[PDB]
Structure formats: C-alpha cells, structure tokens
Amino acid sequence: STGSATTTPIDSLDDAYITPVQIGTPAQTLNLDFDTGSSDLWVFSSETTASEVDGQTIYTPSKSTTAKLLSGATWSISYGDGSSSSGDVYTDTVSVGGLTVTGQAVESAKKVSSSFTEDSTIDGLLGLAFSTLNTVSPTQQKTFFDNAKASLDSPVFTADLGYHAPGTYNFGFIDTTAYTGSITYTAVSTKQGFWEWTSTGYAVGSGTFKSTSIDGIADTGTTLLYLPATVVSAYWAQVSGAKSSSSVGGYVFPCSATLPSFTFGVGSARIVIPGDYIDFGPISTGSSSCFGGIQSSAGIGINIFGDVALKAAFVVFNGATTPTLGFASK
Ligand SMILES: Cc1oc2ncn(CCCN(C)C)c(=N)c2c1C
Numbered sequence: 001s002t003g004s005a006t007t008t009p010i011d012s013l014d015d016a017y018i019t020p021v022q023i024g025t026p027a028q029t030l031n032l033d034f035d036t037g038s039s040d041l042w043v044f045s046s047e048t049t050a051s052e053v054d055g056q057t058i059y060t061p062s063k064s065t066t067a068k069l070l071s072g073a074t075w076s077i078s079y080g081d082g083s084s085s086s087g088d089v090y091t092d093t094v095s096v097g098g099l100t101v102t103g104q105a106v107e108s109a110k111k112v113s114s115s116f117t118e119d120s121t122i123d124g125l126l127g128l129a130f131s132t133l134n135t136v137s138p139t140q141q142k143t144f145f146d147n148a149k150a151s152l153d154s155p156v157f158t159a160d161l162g163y164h165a166p167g168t169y170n171f172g173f174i175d176t177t178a179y180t181g182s183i184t185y186t187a188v189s190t191k192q193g194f195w196e197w198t199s200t201g202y203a204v205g206s207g208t209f210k211s212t213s214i215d216g217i218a219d220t221g222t223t224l225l226y227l228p229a230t231v232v233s234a235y236w237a238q239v240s241g242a243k244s245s246s247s248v249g250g251y252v253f254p255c256s257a258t259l260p261s262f263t264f265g266v267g268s269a270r271i272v273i274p275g276d277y278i279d280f281g282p283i284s285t286g287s288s289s290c291f292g293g294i295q296s297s298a299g300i301g302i303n304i305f306g307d308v309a310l311k312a313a314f315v316v317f318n319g320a321t322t323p324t325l326g327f328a329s330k
Contacts, residue, residue: 001151002172003099007034007161010121013281014307015223017161018122019169022095023106024064030057030123034169035221036159036195036317037304039133039143040077041094042085042107043124044116052112055120061108067092075107075135080222080300085112089136094144096126099171101148105134105141125221128157128317133193145171145319155319159220160330161311163277179314179328184269188323192302194219195317197325199305200267202227204235205260209270216303218310218317218325224280225262225273225308226297235262235294242292248283251292255282262294264309266327273312 007019018031023043030043044053046060061067067090076086087110094104109124116122127134131142149155152172160178161167168178189196194217203209214227232251236242238260242253253259259275278293293308316326 001099001148002153002170003095003097003148004168004170005097006166007169008166009162009164010119012164014164014311015280016119016122017167017220017307019096019126021126023059024061024092025066026064027095028057028059028064030059031121032124032126033122033221034128034159035125035219036128037217037219037221038077038079038125039127039129039131039193040075040107040135041105041124041126041144042075042077042087042109044112045087045108047087048109049111052117054117057123059106059108059124061090061092061106064092066102067106070105070136070139070141073105073136073139073141075137077135080304081115083113083115085109085116087111089141096144096171097169099148099152101144104144104147105136107136128220129195130190130193132190145317148172149319157317157319159310159315159317161220161307163274163311167311174316179330181329183314183316183326183328184266185316185318185324185326186266188325190323195323195325200265202231202265203263203270204238205275207238209263209265211265214264214303216297216305218305218315220307220310222304222306223308224304224306225278225294226300226304226306227294228303229296229298232294232296235260236292244296248289248291250295252283252289253292255288255290257290264305269327271309271313271327271329273309277308277312
C-alpha cells in the first residue's frame with residue numbers, strides 16, 4: 001500500500017504545516033502537524049477542557065463506531081519549546097492520503113497548554129519519530145508509520161515541504177519526479193529516538209564550504225533551523241544590522257535586508273536554503289525588525305534541522321531495519 005497527502009503552511013510565514021487526517025468511522029477529518037521529532041498521535045477532542053479549545057476541530061470518539069477506549073492508558077508530553085498536552089487513549093481507524101491503519105492509538109487531549117489553544121489551525125500532532133519516544137503509559141504505543149510499515153510497498157515516508165506553498169507527505173514510495181539530481185543517503189542514530197544524523201558542514205551565501213560535523217535531528221515539527229552558536233554567528237555576520245536580542249529571544253535583522261543563502265552538507269552533497277526562507281517577518285505587527293529563521297541551539301542541547309532546512313529538500317525517512325535519511329535538491 002501507499003499514501004499521499006498534501007501538507008499546507010498554516011500561515012503566510014510557514015510557521016508550521018498541517019496535513020488532513022481521517023480518524024474514525026464515519027471519518028472525522030482533523031488537520032494535524034506531522035512531527036518527525038515526536039512519537040504521539042494526539043488530537044483535540046470532545047474531552048478537551050472547554051476553555052482550552054478555541055476554533056480547533058475536535059475528535060469525538062463517541063461518534064466513531066470503530067473507536068475503543070484503551071483501558072487504563074494515559075499520555076502526557078512536553079515539547080522542546082515548552083508546550084505540553086495530556087489525556088487518555090482510544091484505538092481507532094486512521095487514514096492519511098489513502099493509507100489506512102486500523103487499531104491506531106489516538107491520544108485524546110484532556111488538557112493542552114496555551115500555545116496549542118492559541119493556534120486555531122492545528123488540531124493535534126501526528127508523531128513520526130521512533131516509537132520508543134511514545135508517551136502512552138503503562139503500555140507504550142506505536143506511531144502511525146510503524147503500524148503502517150509492514151503493509152507499505154517500501155518501509156519509507158517522504159517529506160516535501162513547500163516554501164510559502166503546499167507540499168506533500170508520501171508513505172510507502174519515493175516519487176522520483178519530485179526532486180532533481182540524486183538522493184544522497186546518510187546514517188541515522190536512533191539512540192535518542194530521533195531521526196538523528198550528521199551534516200558534513202555548511203556555507204554562508206557564496207562563501208567557502210566549511211567541513212565540520214554537525215550532529216542534529218531532522219524535525220518537521222520544529223519551524224526553524226537551530227545550529228551551534230559559531231555557525232549561526234557566522235551566518236548573521238553577513239547581514240548588516242543583524243543582532244542577537246535577549247528580549248526578543250534570538251537573532252533579529254532589519255526587515256529591509258536581503259538575506260544570504262545557507263548551505264548544509266549531506267555527505268558530499270549540498271542543500272541550499274535560499275535567503276528568503278530564513279525571513280520570519282516582523283517581530284511584532286508594524287515592526288521593522290524581523291525574526292531570523294536560523295537560530296542558536298545553545299541551551300537546547302541538540303541541533304535541529306527544522307522546516308527552514310527541510311523545506312529546501314526532498315527528504316526520505318527510510319524506516320528499514322537500519323534506518324537512514326535521504327536528501328535531494330528539488
Ligand atoms: C505564529 C506561530 O509560530 C509558530 N512557530 C512554531 N510553531 C510550532 C510549534 C510546535 N510546538 C507546539 C511543539 C507554531 N505552531 C507556530 C505558530 C502558530
């Protein structure tokens with residue numbers, strides 16, 4: 001089997017991406033944030049504290065003839081950005097782009113933190129990291145991809161995120177028309193539960209490439225690119241007036257700037273992030289200070305190849321017995 005679903009930016013700045021997902025019988029379609037940095041499929045629901053729901057579409061398990069309460073199971077997750085959610089668990093039929101998994105754990109939120117409530121465009125998350133990170137207790141549950149894997153034509157999924165435009169998540173096949181040149185594959189460590197790999201270096205604009213190992217994770221659920229302070233300083237030094245602002249919470253730059261590109265290495269291959277991808281717009285409405293899309297990972301504890309990086313590539317998440325990651329230009 002295969003599946004193919006369109007993923008769409010939530011706003012004009014690509015602050016996150018949503019993909020429609022069918023849950024239950026009859027189908028209830030929710031727009032979920034596909035997140036290769038976590039491993040829980042959780043949704044706003046009829047059980048979510050009413051004051052914490054503001055415009056999201058909810059899953060109502062009592063209206064699904066295939067929903068079953070997973071007795072005694074609870075979940076609770078805290079994300080790197082400080083957000084969180086928790087609740088109980090159903091199993092139900094979940095379909096993405098024509099690919100159906102029966103008996104998928106659907107984690108129903110009883111509580112969500114303010115940033116979730118405040119984002120009316122995202123009805124939940126669909127985790128695509130390794131199932132070892134799944135938070136369901138006392139019996140850990142599998143991700144949608146892990147459940148689908150055996151049925152897929154090939155044990156892979158691909159992320160093809162757009163810049164200020166829709167893109168695609170495919171399951172079970174590699175669309176050879178969706179990228180240019182060749183896909184370069186690189187080793188993955190699953191030791192921390194992530195799609196963790198090592199970039200071979202970087203360049204800023206038309207500058208020379210610096211060969212240096214940068215360990216990080218391919219994370220579709222993180223918006224920005226988080227790299228070591230040395231790398232990030234080298235990038236922003238090429239932008240007149242750019243500065244790190246403690247009060248704003250990262251590098252900002254004059255909105256009048258034309259940003260340089262940023263290149264990262266995948267083995268001997270190179271992925272180029274155009275400068276415009278690194279502009280996240282005014283820090284507040286009407287401001288002439290703009291927020292940068294490349295930020296320091298110092299104090300995160302890990303480097304994160306988030307959407308800013310991934311959207312410049314066609315990315316293969318190869319879930320074979322020894323997982324690997326592939327990157328192509330597009
Ligand atoms: C205006 C805005 O800026 C954002 N940045 C990251 N995200 C992603 C947050 C992911 N986290 C909850 C685990 C957003 N959802 C978002 C919105 C909305």
